[PDB]
Design a protein around this nucleic acid. Sequence first.
DNA 1: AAGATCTGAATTTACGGGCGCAACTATGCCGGACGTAC
RNA 2: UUUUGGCAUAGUUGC
DNA 3: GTACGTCCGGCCCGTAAATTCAGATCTT
Lengths: 116, 318
Amino acid sequence: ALETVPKDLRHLRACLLCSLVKTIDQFEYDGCDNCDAYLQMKGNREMVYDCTSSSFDGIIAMMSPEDSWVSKWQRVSNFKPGVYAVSVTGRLPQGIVRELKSRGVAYKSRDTAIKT
Amino acid sequence: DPNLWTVKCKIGEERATAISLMRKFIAYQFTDTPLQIKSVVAPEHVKGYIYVEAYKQTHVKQAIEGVGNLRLGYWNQQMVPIKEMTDVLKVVKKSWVRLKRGIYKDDIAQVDYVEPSQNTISLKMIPRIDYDRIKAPPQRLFDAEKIRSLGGDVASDGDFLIFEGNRYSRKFLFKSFAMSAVITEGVKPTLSELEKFREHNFQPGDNVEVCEGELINLQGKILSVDGNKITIMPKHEDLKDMLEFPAQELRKYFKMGDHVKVIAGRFEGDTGLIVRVEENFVILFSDLTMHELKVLPRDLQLCSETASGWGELVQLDP
DNA sequence: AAGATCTGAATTTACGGGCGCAACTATGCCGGACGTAC
RNA sequence: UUUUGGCAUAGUUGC
DNA sequence: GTACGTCCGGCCCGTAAATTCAGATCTT
Ligand SMILES: [Zn+2]
């Protein structure tokens, strides 16, 4: 829905799990639109800061992941439509990753950049 | 719970300091010199220093060691008191914009065409240039004949023109600029800028009446002023007690034959005397001329200064 | 009788003044950012 | 057709 | 593409007050 689309380009942050790109206000007021139940960044700004990225390269505006080869390459075919980041710089703390793993969600990095 | 400690940082490099500290933590999280701090905060608008979350000052000092950017906070650190840790994370908040960078900083820009690409928008600007004559500046109209005559980086397409760093103009600059490089909220230009492209004014000493309520028809002199709900303190006739009135309940009423000045409108700057106060049409004679000037009650103020109403010898030619 | 506390009376740091006038020569802010030109 | 100007540090020197 | 040049950001002394000890008017 339109709630996922960013309002403006200032303070655009990419999530560290699903690469979801949103403004800081949208993260504060709605959290994550894909896996907030697994991260719970709504209602706490520090969780957003520790769970989102200030450095991202490339944006993909996905409408239809079910029939998109870009989603297959980016492994985001099973997520909802939105704005995602091609490359995301950052990493969750070990505590959040361990908590996700205990719930059966292994943390797979979205840093698909070629580092030299 | 841990506590926040202030550490002075290089100005303009606080987010980079936070990123570097996060990388430092992740690099040494398995080694024999762990960073015992909990988090690092570099707010968006707080410039000059950052905050470190820890139970001890010694932990902060041993964690920032090797960070040159924080060397000015290395010897001593200052704790955030307890009651105030909720304020560190507290955050607040064909149109017209104003450019952020370049020589056109804080200059009015009429949004000519908005590009749905969400990268840049086309803006109409007045050029602040010297037309490549002084450099080897106030706003003035774009002169295409002058820049054609002086030469240099100039390409002409009738009324349209490219010049001096790919600046695009037509008839008036018309150039694309980044949306993040302009402000869309809080410009509110004036009538002069419209040509280029309610209100409450109570003052101390003025006389105001009451138009409605149980305290109607009480005329008093203004003491204090505030923004919207003034809660005024007017010195009424035959009343030693001070009452309360908002801006909406009051009106700038003035008795006949008292000093009057005009605050705004066509008659601004003129002083004089009111002759008869009707329900809203207040008629006055100026101190300069004996012409009838009809004003609203709100466009009148009680000032006793004499009118200004100069006369120098100048040489039209020898 | 006792026991306090308890309230006026010997000992340590801290400003803060420090000659008239007069004459002469002598010395005295920069670092990043943004753009121009080549 | 009638001007005007650094200052406030240190030194040295004279009675 | 590199660098540079140049415009915007950063001893006394007397006082004098603070520190220490026996009436005193209580309580027991
Ligand atoms: Zn997430």
